[PDB]
Design a protein around this ligand. Structure first.
Ligand SMILES: Nc1ncnc2c1ncn2[C@@H]1O[C@@H](COP(=O)(O)OP(=O)(O)OC[C@@H]2O[C@H](O)[C@H](O)[C@@H]2O)[C@@H](O)[C@H]1O
Ligand SMILES: Nc1ncnc2c1ncn2[C@@H]1O[C@H](COP(=O)(O)OP(=O)(O)OC[C@H]2O[C@H](O)[C@H](O)[C@@H]2O)[C@@H](O)[C@H]1O
Lengths: 168, 177
């Protein structure tokens, strides 16, 4: 029950509504977190995911960074039925750097072995405002030819309208 | 050789199986949510070198304390067919490093059965178990899974079997038929 090829869906809303939708439509999926390399889940989707997943997830992440140092990608328990795992991905920050290629590498790092359904925020395009258009294009490049299902979500309607502009 | 600190989980009424296909982190993600504590089984060599396969992933995950524990123990006691070590991971009661047999070894079935039997650790009820010997040890996965079910039959334990390979897990589903 892989898909035959890449399938997209969209959701504009807070994490709670996104997760309810993904559970209804995917049944089981990986949630992607827009993380920093310290896994310090202080704001944005990171805070929402840490609040939703709870203290065992926050503790997991903190403990891992303590043992292994800062991480650019960290796959964790979610402690939530239907969420196979959290994939904490570190996007570039504004003034970075070289944004398109960094965002492609970030979205490519979303894929995990044994997971087909992904619930994915617009990386880098909130708490440190990278242009959402390059994040979104970067995602489309990253996932080309992958047999996965991707539910792109965001608080901003503009992000999804823009995404629909190429899927339309 | 002493015993591991006993589980706070109780044994199930009968043998219970779960499965997970994918990378180690995805497996452990599932095990941490389903089991409050467990033993993870490593498909080791007698040197406890962890140079490839699931051993390398487990070594990387558990970290340098784990690496150091194994190198020190082997240095002092020599090579080991079985070593139960600390994990240095919350929820992971111990790592049971089991050396499975290899392609062409004589009495290969019976050696697999014995290897899975050695998985059991006193005071552990929940196990996360790979398909022993089916990677670089070259053993047919079907025979390894058959041997596992033989070794665990009648045991009041919970076993999450895992593999990178969907075919391995589909096979196991067909033994439950
Ligand atoms: N990163 C991983 N995540 C999850 N499962 C894995 C991973 N790597 C391998 N596996 C799975 O564990 C397997 C056991 O395969 P190997 O790891 O190759 O084990 P084995 O065939 O017993 O080989 C023995 C060993 O190889 C290692 O180098 C080890 O140190 C010893 O030399 C199969 O089920 C395989 O899909
Ligand atoms: N509660 C929420 N629900 C749904 N989506 C959200 C929420 N909060 C933010 N988002 C969305 O997540 C995407 C990424 O926004 P941020 O979370 O601000 O992520 P990012 O810009 O990559 O910044 C990462 C940094 O912010 C966090 O503090 C995190 O710990 C890291 O330091 C955007 O599409 C944004 O609308």
């Amino acid at each position: 029950e892989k898909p035959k090829f890449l399938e997209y869906k969209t959701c504009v809303g807070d994490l709670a509504v996104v997760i309810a939708k993904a559970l209804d439509e995917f049944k089981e999926f990986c949630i992607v977190n827009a993380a920093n390399e310290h896994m310090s889940h202080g704001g944005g989707v990171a805070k929402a995911i840490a609040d939703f997943c709870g203290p065992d997830f926050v503790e997991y992440c903190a403990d891992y960074v303590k043992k292994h140092g800062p991480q650019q990608k960290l796959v964790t328990p979610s402690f939530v039925k239907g969420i196979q795992c959290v994939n904490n991905v570190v996007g570039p920050r504004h003034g970075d750097s070289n944004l398109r290629e960094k965002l492609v590498a970030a979205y490519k790092s979303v894929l995990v072995g044994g997971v087909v359904n992904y619930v994915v925020p617009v990386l880098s395009s909130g708490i440190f405002g990278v242009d959402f258009k390059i994040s979104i294009d970067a995602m489309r490049e990253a996932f080309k030819g992958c047999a996965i299902r991707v539910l792109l979500f965001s608080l901003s309607q503009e992000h999804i309208d823009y995404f629909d502009a190429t899927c339309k």
